[PDB]
Design a protein around this nucleic acid. Structure first.
Lengths: 134, 200, 224, 246, 185
RNA sequence: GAAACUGCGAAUGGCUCAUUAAAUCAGUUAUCGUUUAUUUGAUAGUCAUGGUAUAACUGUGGUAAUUCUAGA
C-alpha cells in the first residue's frame, strides 16, 4: 500500500567538507510526513553509513502530499559530523546538548551592570560593607 | 567456517571448472570468461551468436492445448549467480527446472516443465478462475478476490523463482506461489479503467 | 603538564607531537559499521567503491581506472592477484597521502579477502610498508601514521594463525623498525605485535620469547 | 561618511557577480588586495555561488581554517579575498586547478586547469620603472612587482610568469596581429586579434580588433590584454573561444 | 532596507463603467463559463489588450527585421504552447484575431466541462474546489489554469479523491458507520 | 582563566533632510598639485640579551551622590 521510497539527486562528494551533498526526494503515497530519524536510518543503511554522521533537513511535502523533497548530508564519520555541523542541528540530533543561558536581555543588562563596574571589586565590596557598618 | 573462506572456496571450485572447460575446448580465455561475467552483470550487446545458428535443422513441434485463446507465456530459466554461487532458483528439488507459465482467456494459468529440448512441455500444474471470484461490492477500491474473474491477459514470473504475477481485464494483479499456484497476494489497481496490459 | 582542562572553543591547535601522544591503534578497542564488514559482495570491492566515492586524488584515480578495468569480482581477484598487487605497490611507492589512505584501506581489505595465500605478497608488503613509515617520519602526518598502523593491525587480525605459527620471523621483519630510534614508532609496532603476542599459543610463545632473549643479547647495545 | 565603509549593499554589487536580490541585503564587501574593486570576486561567492560546495560563512570559514586552497600557491584565510581575472585556484582534496577568466556573457568564468597550466600564470605589465639604487623593475596588472626584467619589455606587455618561482617565464610584446583578450567594456571577453591602435597624445588610445568571424570593434588599451600569437595562445581557452553570437 | 519585491495589479477597469452591450457580454460569458467576477473579466481582457497591442506594434514594425521576427516567433510559440493560436493560424493577423472566448475555453473549468467530468461548468468548478482532479500528476484547485495541450490530454481524477482514487469521504463513511451501528443494533 | 596592562576597533552601520538655488547632484575630467592605518607584491651584512616603572592585587581613607577617588 504505502512505500516510503527515499531517492537522491545531484550527489556531490565534498572531501573538503568530507561529506556528500544530495537532494533528497521522498515518495510516501498513502502516507504523510515520515520522520527524519527514520529517513536518516534508511539513508545510513543505504549508504552503509552511520545515522549520527547522516544529517537531513529542510524538507517540504508537495501540494497535496505523498511526496516530500528536502536536503540531506552524510559526513565520512561521526568525527567529521561532530567537527562540522551546526550545534543546533547537533542538539536536534541529540549529539550536542542544548546550552542553558540567561536571555539576551538578562545578558545585555548584566553586561551593562558589570561594565559600569570597574576592577575586580572585592575591595569595593569590603569598603561598602564597612561603610554600611558606619 | 568463515564466509570469506567459503566464498573463496566457491571461487576455487569456479576457477577449477573454468580451467577444466578451457582444457576441454583446447582438446587468457579464463579471464575472458570473467569479463563475460562482468558484461552479463552490465554490458552492451555482447552475445554474438548471430552466425553459429543452424536454422535449417531447427526442430519444430507444435503443441495443441485444450484451453482456448492463449494470451501470454512466461519462461523461468534459473541461472547461476556471479556474486553468490548457489543458484537463482529457490528450492533444492528444482535444481534448474525450466518452467513455463501460460495464461489463457479461459481464465487459466498453467505451469509446464520444459526442462528437456527433445520432449514435449509437460503440464505440471494449473489454476483456473471463474465467476465465483466476482466481487460483491463492484464499486470500491477493494478487488481482493483470490482468483481472477474476468479475462486474464498477462503473466510474469519473478526472477527469484518464488512468485508469479498475473494481470488481466479484471483490473487486478494476483501474485501466486509457483508450486501450489496459491494466491499469495492480490493488488487491486483501484481504478475504473486500470486494466492490466503487459508486465515487466 | 598537558591540556587537562578543556576550554570551550571547538578548535584546538593540537600540535603534531600531541597528536602522536594521543594516537592509539586497535580497531577492536574501536569499532564501527565498516562498509566491508557491512555489505558482503566482496570486502575489497566494497572498500573500492567506497573510496571511489570518497577520494579525489589523481594518483588514486589513475589507480582506480586500471583496477576498475581489471577486477569486478572475487574470481577476478583470484585470477589477476599479482598484477593488482603490483599496481598497488607501484602507487604505494608513488607516495601520495591523499591516495595513501584509501590505498592502505584497499590493502587491508585485499588481505582480508586474500588471506591464507597472501603471505608471499605480504612479506615485501611489510618491506614497502615500513619504507612508507620512514617516508611519513620524513613527512609529519599523524593521519598517515594512524592509517599505516591500522592497516598493520588489520593484516594481523586477518592473517593471525599463519603468523602465530611463523611468529619469530614476523618479529624479525619489524625488528629494524622496533629497534628504530623513534619511541612512538616503537610504541605503535609494539601495540600491533602485542596484539599478536596476546593471540599466540604457548609453545610458539616460549620459542619466540627465548629467541627474543637471544636477540636481546645480540643487540645488547640497543635500549630502544 | 567620516571614513571608509565596511558595508556592501545587495544592489551595490557589480552586476556581473550574478547575485540575487533576495537572499541578502548585503553583499560581502571584498577586502583590499591585488585587483581593484569591481573586477574581483570574493572566494565565498566563488565557492558558494558557483562551486556550491559550501552554503554558509561558517562552512567556508571552517574550510579556510582547514587550509585547503592555495591561490598561486599561497593559501589565503580571508573570506572576502579579492580574486580577480586570470587567476590560478588550486584544489588539493579535489585535485583540480582553475583559471578565473572572463565570460562570453560578460561575467567571470572558472576554467578546469591542469597542474602544468597552473604552474605558471599570465600578467599584463602595466608599469616599468627604475627603482632606488638604479634597479629596473615592473609592476603587472595583478600587482606583481618584479625586479630586473628583460629590457625589451615595455608597459602593457603580456608576460608568462612561473608561479612556482614567481619568475618571468617569458614575455609577449604589443604588436598588431596579436591575439588579445578584452577585459572591460561592453565587448569584454570577446577574444580577437588586434587590427591596430588609434593613438592620441595624452588621450585614451583606441584599439581596433578583429576576431575569427572577421568582426571588428574598438576598445581602450586598458581593456586591451594581449594573450598570444595568431592560433598561439599560451593558455587553454574555454568553450566558445570568446565569440559573441545571436 | 531591502529589495522591493515587484508586483502588479493584474487587471484594469473599463473606460465607460456602465454600458448595456458590455453588461450583456459579461452576463452571457459569465453564465456561459460558470464565472463569477467582473474583475476576472478585466484580468483576461487586460491580457488580450496587452498582447494584441504588442502584436500591432510588431505589425507596424518592418518585415524581416530580426527583432520583429524574434518577437513574433516568441509570441506565436507561446500562444500555440498554451493552445490558443492554432497551427494553421500561425500569423500575426490571426494573433490579432484571437479572442477572450478562446482564452475562456483554454481555461481549465471550461476544458474539464468539455471533457464531461461534470454535468455543469459550475459543477466542474465545484469539483475543482473539492480538489478531485489532478493535472498530469499535480493536483490543482484553481479553475483558471489555462492548460497546455499535453496537460488537457493529461486531465484525470485525483488518486486521493474518493472518485478517482482513495477511500470515500467523511459523509459516506459516517453514514456507513451509522448504518452499521443501526443494523448491529 | 576573573581582573588588569598591551593590541585594534569603536571615524561603518542605523535615523533625518533642518540647511543649501551652479552650491550639491549628474555626466565628463584631471591632479606632472595631495596623503593613505590596512591588503597584496617586492624591499635592509655597512649581548649568553641594561634599566625605569605602574595597573591589576594587598592595606588606610573621603562623600549625599556618579563608570568619583586620595594616600601608601
Amino acid at each position: 500500500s504505502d512505500a516510503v521510497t527515499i531517492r537522491t539527486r545531484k550527489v556531490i562528494s565534498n572531501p573538503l567538507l568530507a561529506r556528500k551533498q544530495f537532494v533528497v526526494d521522498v515518495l510516501h503515497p498513502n502516507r504523510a510526513n515520515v520522520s527524519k530519524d527514520e529517513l536518516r536510518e534508511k539513508l545510513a543503511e543505504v549508504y552503509k553509513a552511520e545515522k549520527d554522521a547522516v544529517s537531513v533537513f529542510g524538507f517540504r511535502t508537495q501540494f497535496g502530499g505523498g511526496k516530500s523533497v528536502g536536503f540531506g548530508l552524510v559526513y565520512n564519520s561521526v568525527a567529521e559530523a561532530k567537527k562540522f555541523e551546526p550545534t543546533y542541528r547537533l542538539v536536534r540530533y541529540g549529539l550536542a546538548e542544548k546550552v542553558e543561558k540567561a536571555s539576551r536581555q538578562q545578558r545585555k543588562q548584566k553586561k551593562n551592570r558589570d561594565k559600569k563596574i570597574f576592577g575586580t571589586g572585592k575591595r569595593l565590596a569590603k569598603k561598602v560593607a564597612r561603610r554600611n557598618a558606619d | 567456517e568463515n564466509p570469506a573462506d567459503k566464498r573463496r572456496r566457491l571461487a576455487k571450485q569456479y576457477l577449477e571448472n573454468l580451467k577444466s572447460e578451457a582444457n576441454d575446448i583446447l582438446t587468457d580465455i579464463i579471464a575472458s570468461r570473467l569479463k563475460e561475467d562482468v558484461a552479463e552483470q552490465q554490458g552492451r550487446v555482447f552475445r554474438y551468436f548471430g552466425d553459429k545458428l543452424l536454422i535449417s535443422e531447427a526442430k519444430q513441434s507444435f503443441t495443441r492445448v485444450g484451453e482456448n485463446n492463449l494470451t501470454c507465456i512466461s519462461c523461468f530459466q534459473p541461472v547461476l549467480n556471479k556474486y553468490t554461487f548457489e543458484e537463482s532458483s529457490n528450492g533444492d528439488k528444482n535444481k534448474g527446472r525450466l518452467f513455463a507459465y501460460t495464461v489463457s482467456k479461459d481464465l487459466q494459468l498453467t505451469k509446464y516443465d520444459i526442462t528437456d529440448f527433445s520432449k514435449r512441455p509437460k503440464k505440471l500444474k494449473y489454476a483456473k478462475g471463474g465467476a465465483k471470484y466476482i466481487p460483491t461490492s463492484k464499486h470500491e477500491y477493494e478487488n481482493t478476490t483470490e482468483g481472477h474473474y474476468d479475462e486474464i491477459l498477462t503473466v510474469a514470473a519473478s526472477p527469484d523463482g518464488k512468485y508469479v504475477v498475473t494481470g488481466g481485464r479484471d483490473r487486478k494483479l494476483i501474485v501466486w506461489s509457483t508450486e501450489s499456484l496459491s494466491p499469495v497476494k492480490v493488488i487491486p489497481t483501484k481504478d475504473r479503467r486500470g486494466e492490466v496490459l503487459s508486465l515487466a | 603538564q598537558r591540556q587537562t582542562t578543556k576550554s570551550s572553543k571547538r578548535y584546538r591547535y593540537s600540535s603534531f607531537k600531541a597528536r602522536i601522544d594521543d594516537l592509539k591503534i586497535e580497531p577492536a578497542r574501536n569499532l564501527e559499521k565498516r562498509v566491508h564488514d557491512y555489505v558482503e559482495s566482496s570486502h575489497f570491492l566494497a572498500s573500492f567503491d567506497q573510496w571511489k566515492e570518497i577520494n579525489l586524488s589523481a594518483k588514486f584515480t589513475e589507480f582506480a581506472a586500471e583496477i576498475e578495468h581489471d577486477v569486478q569480482t572475487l574470481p577476478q581477484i583470484l585470477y589477476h592477484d599479482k598484477k593488482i598487487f603490483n599496481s598497488l605497490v607501484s602507487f604505494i611507492n608513488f607516495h601520495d597521502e591523499f591516495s595513501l589512505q584509501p590505498l592502505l584501506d584497499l590493502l587491508a581489505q585485499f588481505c582480508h579477502d586474500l588471506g591464507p595465500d597472501f603471505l608471499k605478497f605480504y612479506e615485501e608488503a611489510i618491506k614497502t610498508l615500513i619504507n612508507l613509515l620512514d617516508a611519513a617520519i620524513e613527512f609529519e602526518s599523524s593521519n598517515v601514521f594512524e592509517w599505516g598502523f591500522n592497516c598493520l593491525a588489520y593484516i594481523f587480525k586477518y592473517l593471525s594463525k599463519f603468523l602465530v605459527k611463523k611468529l619469530v620471523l614476523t618479529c624479525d621483519l619489524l625488528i629494524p623498525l622496533l629497534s628504530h630510534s623513534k619511541e612512538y614508532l616503537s610504541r605503535f609496532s609494539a601495540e600491533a605485535l602485542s596484539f599478536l603476542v596476546r593471540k599466540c599459543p604457548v609453545s610458539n610463545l616460549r620459542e619466540f620469547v627465548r629467541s627474543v632473549f637471544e636477540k636481546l643479547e645480540g643487540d645488547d647495545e640497543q635500549t630502544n | 561618511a567620516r571614513g571608509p565603509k565596511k558595508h556592501l549593499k545587495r544592489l551595490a554589487a557589480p552586476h556581473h557577480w550574478l547575485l540575487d536580490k533576495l537572499s541578502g541585503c548585503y553583499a560581502p564587501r571584498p577586502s583590499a588586495g591585488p585587483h581593484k574593486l569591481r573586477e574581483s570576486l570574493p572566494l565565498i561567492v566563488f565557492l558558494r555561488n558557483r562551486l556550491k560546495y559550501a552554503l554558509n560563512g561558517r562552512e567556508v570559514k571552517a574550510i579556510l581554517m582547514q587550509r585547503h586552497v592555495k591561490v598561486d600557491g599561497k593559501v589565503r584565510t580571508d573570506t572576502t579575498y579579492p580574486a580577480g581575472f586570470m587567476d590560478v585556484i588550486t584544489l588539493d582534496a579535489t585535485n583540480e586547478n582553475f583559471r578565473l577568466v572572463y565570460d562570453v556573457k560578460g561575467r567571470f568564468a572558472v576554467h578546469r586547469i591542469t597542474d602544468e597550466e597552473a604552474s605558471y600564470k599570465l600578467g599584463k605589465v602595466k608599469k616599468v620603472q627604475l627603482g632606488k639604487k638604479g634597479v629596473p623593475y615592473v609592476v603587472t596588472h595583478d600587482g606583481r612587482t618584479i625586479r630586473y626584467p628583460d629590457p625589451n619589455i615595455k608597459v602593457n606587455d603580456t608576460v608568462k610568469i612561473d608561479l612556482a618561482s614567481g619568475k618571468i617565464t617569458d614575455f609577449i610584446k604589443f604588436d598588431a596581429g596579436k591575439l588579445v583578450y578584452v577585459t572591460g567594456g561592453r565587448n569584454l571577453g570577446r577574444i580577437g586579434t588586434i587590427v591596430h591602435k588609434e593613438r592620441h597624445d595624452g588621450g585614451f588610445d583606441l584599439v581596433h580588433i578583429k576576431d575569427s568571424l572577421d568582426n571588428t570593434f574598438v576598445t581602450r588599451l586598458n581593456n586591451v590584454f594581449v594573450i598570444g600569437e595568431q592560433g598561439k595562445p599560451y593558455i587553454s581557452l574555454p568553450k566558445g573561444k570568446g565569440i559573441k553570437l545571436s | 532596507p531591502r529589495a522591493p519585491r515587484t508586483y502588479s495589479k493584474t487587471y484594469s477597469t473599463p473606460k465607460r463603467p456602465y454600458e448595456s452591450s458590455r453588461l450583456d457580454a459579461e452576463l452571457k460569458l459569465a453564465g456561459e463559463f460558470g464565472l463569477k467576477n467582473k474583475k476576472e473579466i478585466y484580468r483576461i481582457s487586460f491580457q488580450l489588450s496587452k498582447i494584441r497591442r504588442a502584436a500591432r506594434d510588431l505589425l507596424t514594425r518592418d518585415e524581416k527585421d530580426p527583432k520583429r521576427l524574434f518577437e513574433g516567433n516568441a509570441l506565436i510559440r507561446r500562444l500555440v504552447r498554451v493552445g490558443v493560436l492554432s497551427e494553421d493560424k500561425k500569423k500575426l493577423d490571426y494573433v490579432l484575431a484571437l479572442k477572450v472566448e478562446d482564452f475562456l475555453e483554454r481555461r481549465l473549468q471550461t476544458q474539464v466541462y468539455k471533457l464531461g467530468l461534470a454535468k455543469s461548468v459550475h459543477h466542474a468548478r465545484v469539483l475543482i474546489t473539492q480538489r478531485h482532479i489532478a493535472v498530469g500528476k499535480q493536483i490543482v484547485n484553481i479553475p483558471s489554469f489555462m492548460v497546455r495541450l499535453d496537460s488537457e490530454k493529461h486531465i484525470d481524477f485525483a488518486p486521493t479523491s474518493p472518485f478517482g482514487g482513495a477511500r470515500p469521504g467523511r459523509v459516506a463513511r459516517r453514514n456507513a458507520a451509522r448504518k452499521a451501528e443501526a443494523s448491529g443494533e
